[PDB]
Amino acid sequence: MYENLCKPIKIGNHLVKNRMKYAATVDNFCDTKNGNVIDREIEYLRERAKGGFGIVVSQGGYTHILGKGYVGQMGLVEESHLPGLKKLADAINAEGAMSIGQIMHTGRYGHAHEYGIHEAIAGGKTVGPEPVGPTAMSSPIKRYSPCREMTPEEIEEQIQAHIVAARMFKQTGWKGVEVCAIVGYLIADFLSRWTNKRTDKWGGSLENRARFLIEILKGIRKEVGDDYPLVMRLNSTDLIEGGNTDEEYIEIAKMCEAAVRIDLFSITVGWHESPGAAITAEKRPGDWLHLADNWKKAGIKAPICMAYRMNQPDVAEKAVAEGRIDIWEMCRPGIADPYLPKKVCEGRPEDIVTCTACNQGCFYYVFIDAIMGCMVNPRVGNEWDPAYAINPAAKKKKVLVVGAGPSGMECARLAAVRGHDVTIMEKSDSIGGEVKLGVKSPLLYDWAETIRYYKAQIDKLGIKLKLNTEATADSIKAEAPDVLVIATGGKPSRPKIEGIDNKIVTNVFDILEGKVKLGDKVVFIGGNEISIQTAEYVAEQGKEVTVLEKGKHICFDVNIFNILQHRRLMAKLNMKSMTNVTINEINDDGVEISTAGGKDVTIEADNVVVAEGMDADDALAKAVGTKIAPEVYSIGDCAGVRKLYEAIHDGYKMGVKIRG
């Protein structure tokens, strides 16, 4: 089934069992006080190695405190870091994965001041805690603070720190070393003409900008020796106006191959300051592969790997078959499903927990300096935690799950995996709940992969699925289960708006279930994530859509990464939006609003969607109490409206805790 992806490959002298590589992922799982590797990190990475990845990369470790860019970033500076690095290599290696350690000074993106640092020693001098770069400059975005210009002594010290980092990996049993020269971190800062205005030997010509990197590479090669695998990450495109050209990145790669033997090139897209889409759902699998072709035709010797929205095994298999890339590299597909390679090579891709590119538990949580999680994978960061262990149930119980939404389906899946006798009662003709409605939205196409996964799991686990079956107090009593799990989700709210009872008024459920025929002018009251995604579905059908928000911003419940993707799509779809508006009335003609400036205006509509929020659909839970069955639980939105992350996590927590 996946002959090309499951084919072995030599990386330097080391033979890798397949073409699937798990990419570097800073997750804030390391000790925030000192950069030490701890059990949370060991177990996270051990699971990707158990999952069958041929190559497992560590997160990028800072070579100096000023280069620490995440609250729990791994350190590569002191002798005290060596024990944890050994423990991490042993855990990855024992699984038969090639352990590769990554070196990553975050440069201009450093946040030492926020991590309780007020002073440090750099280039033999006491300096402030500000981030460092080849040139003193500011960032076009708030997140990153103005950087200080490194002295040549600081530049020389960093080459030495990179060599030391490489030595630390080799002595602790790591099978290879990866130099992170991407996305706007320190090396990428010296490489790009946008960030490097230096007039000495470290900037100017392309060779001068590449000198820091070449010196780091030459230094590492001399230290680790000729037989040790030395790999690297380099941009194929920075998506920065005034940055380096795509051909320039190829010329840099050729400078690297000419100085040291490079055993693998990981090719990347964008900088964190890039205004364009790189990793969102706007990018489909294979949208970046032409870049790999250009590296191949330029004559790059070393094997090449590429990630960047490559979440589909069929797209990657073809890419490797055609020799476009030698290795399918991935980060978020491996966060979502650490067993993706084991599933690919056993020929069971219907079992894959696909990454939906929601950027919540991964990108968002890490950038807001929180412990990394995952929407579709509740085990992310919890692999080390005994409360998340999946153990067979001693005595089998009759488990009744009410509702085939994501919380109910995750609970049912875990309870059946652990050996319970599980039944799901679903009031509609299909599974998925609000996920089934959401999949109609332009950016939520990968939600069909979530429906596919659960449908295949229910089948395989022998869960008794009862569709078109509304659970009532009497049908529960007839079923007589040992455990009742209520997962009836949420329902659109009905705020106290004048003229809400008007026939022009509809809701998000009616739109997405096809229970309403819409006109040409459609007006949405509410600017939350759900309202926006239903509005985007309506506008994509070539209709005139206006979104009215009483609060200060639209997409107020949307994470920082997805905010941009909605701005781009609402512009492309010619969508109108108004914030700080007072909704006065809904009438036959549309909705009467008063702006914050005091202007009374009529928003003309054929349909008015009242989408201000969701209420818990808890009527069943209130009707039956806590005594209808020996154990009664409410999970997901019916227990209090939250979002998908909390629904899938509630489901998992419920499924693992059902006792025997």
Ligand X SMILES: Cc1cc2nc3c(=O)[nH]c(=O)nc-3n(C[C@H](O)[C@H](O)[C@H](O)COP(=O)(O)O)c2cc1C
Ligand Y SMILES: CC(C)(COP(=O)(O)OP(=O)(O)OC[C@H]1O[C@@H](n2cnc3c(N)ncnc32)[C@H](O)[C@@H]1OP(=O)(O)O)[C@@H](O)C(=O)NCCC(=O)NCCSC(=O)c1ccc2ccccc2c1
Query: To the nearest whole angstrom, how small is the minimum distance from the Cβ of residue 275 to ligand Y?
Result: 4
Residue type, 408: G
The 3-class SS string of 427-444 reads CCCCCCCHHHHHCCCHHH
Check binding of 30 to ligand SF4 (CB under 6 A).
no
Taking each continuous run of H as one helix and of E as one strand, the counts in the chain are 21, 29
Site for ligand FAD, rule CB under 6 A: 402-408, 425-428, 433-435, 437-438, 441, 470-471, 487-490, 508, 512, 529-530, 533-534, 617, 620, 636-637, 643-645, 647
Among ligand SF4, ligand FAD, ligand Y, none, partner that 66 touches (CB below 5 to 8 angstroms by kind): none
d(CA 645, CA 201): 50
Query: To the nearest whole angstrom, how small is the minimum distance from the Cβ of residue 609 to ligand SF4?
Result: 27
Check binding of 562 to ligand X (CB under 6 A).
no
d(CA 166, CA 172): 10
Question: Is the Cβ of residue 570 or residue 620 nearer to ligand Y in the bound state?
Answer: 570
256 assigned ligand-binding residue? no
Instruction: Tell me if 139 sits within 8 A of 146, measured CB to CB.
Output: yes
Instruction: Tell me if 26 sits within 8 A of 70, measured CB to CB.
Output: yes
Query: To the nearest whole angstrom, how small is the minimum distance from the Cβ of residue 370 to ligand Y?
Result: 13
Site for ligand Y in 183-202 (CB under 6 A): 183
Q: Give residue for tokens 């699937």.
A: 20
Site for ligand Y in 357-376 (CB under 6 A): 366-367
Residue 120: which H helix or E strand, with range?
A: strand 120-122
Stretch near ligand Y under the rule CB under 6 A, chosen from 11-19, 139-147, 445-453, 530-538 = 139-147
DSSP 517: -
Query: To the nearest whole angstrom, how small is the minimum distance from the Cβ of residue 183 to ligand Y?
Result: 4
Distant-in-sequence, close-in-space partners of 43: CB < 8 Å, separation ≥ 6:
91, 383, 384
Among ligand SF4, ligand Y, ligand FAD, none, partner that 270 touches (CB below 5 to 8 angstroms by kind): ligand Y
| Rg, Å, the chain Cα set | 27
Check binding of 40 to ligand X (CB under 6 A).
no
Among ligand X, ligand FAD, ligand Y, none, partner that 489 touches (CB below 5 to 8 angstroms by kind): ligand FAD
Check binding of 338 to ligand SF4 (CB under 6 A).
no
Name the token pair of 61. 């470790």
Angle at 206 between CA 202 and CA 212, to 5 degrees: 35
Question: Is the Cβ of residue 82 or residue 564 nearer to ligand Y in the bound state?
Answer: 564
Site for ligand SF4 in 308-337 (CB under 6 A): 332, 335-336
Site for ligand Y in 538-567 (CB under 6 A): 560-561, 563-564
Q: Quick one: which of 271, 308, 524, 652 contacts ligand X (CB under 6 A)?
A: 308
The neighbour count for residue 579, using CB atoms within 10 Å, is 16
The neighbour count for residue 296, using CB atoms within 10 Å, is 14
CA dihedral in degrees (646, 648, 651, 656; nearest 10)?
A: -110
Q: How far apart are the first and last CA of the chain?
A: 39
Residue type, 403: G
Check binding of 100 to ligand X (CB under 6 A).
no
Find the discontinuities in the chain where C to next N exceeds 2.5 angstroms and give the residue preceding each: none
DSSP 243: S
Check binding of 362 to ligand SF4 (CB under 6 A).
yes
Question: Is the Cβ of residue 84 or residue 405 nearer to ligand FAD in the bound state?
Answer: 405
| Of residues 269, 271, 263, 260, the one with CA closest to residue 292 | 269
Distant-in-sequence, close-in-space partners of 597: CB < 8 Å, separation ≥ 6:
none
Check binding of 358 to ligand X (CB under 6 A).
no
The binding site consists of 24, 26, 60, 102, 104, 180, 233, 308-309, 331-332, 355, 358, 362, 374, 407, 426-427, 434, 471, 490, 533, 637, 644
Binding site members for [4Fe-4S] cluster = 355, 358, 362, 374
Binding site for ligand X (CB under 6 A): 23-26, 59-60, 102, 104, 180, 182, 233, 268, 279, 307-310, 330-333, 362-363, 366, 372
Q: Which segments are annotated as binding site for FAD? A: 407, 426-427, 434, 471, 490, 533, 637, 644
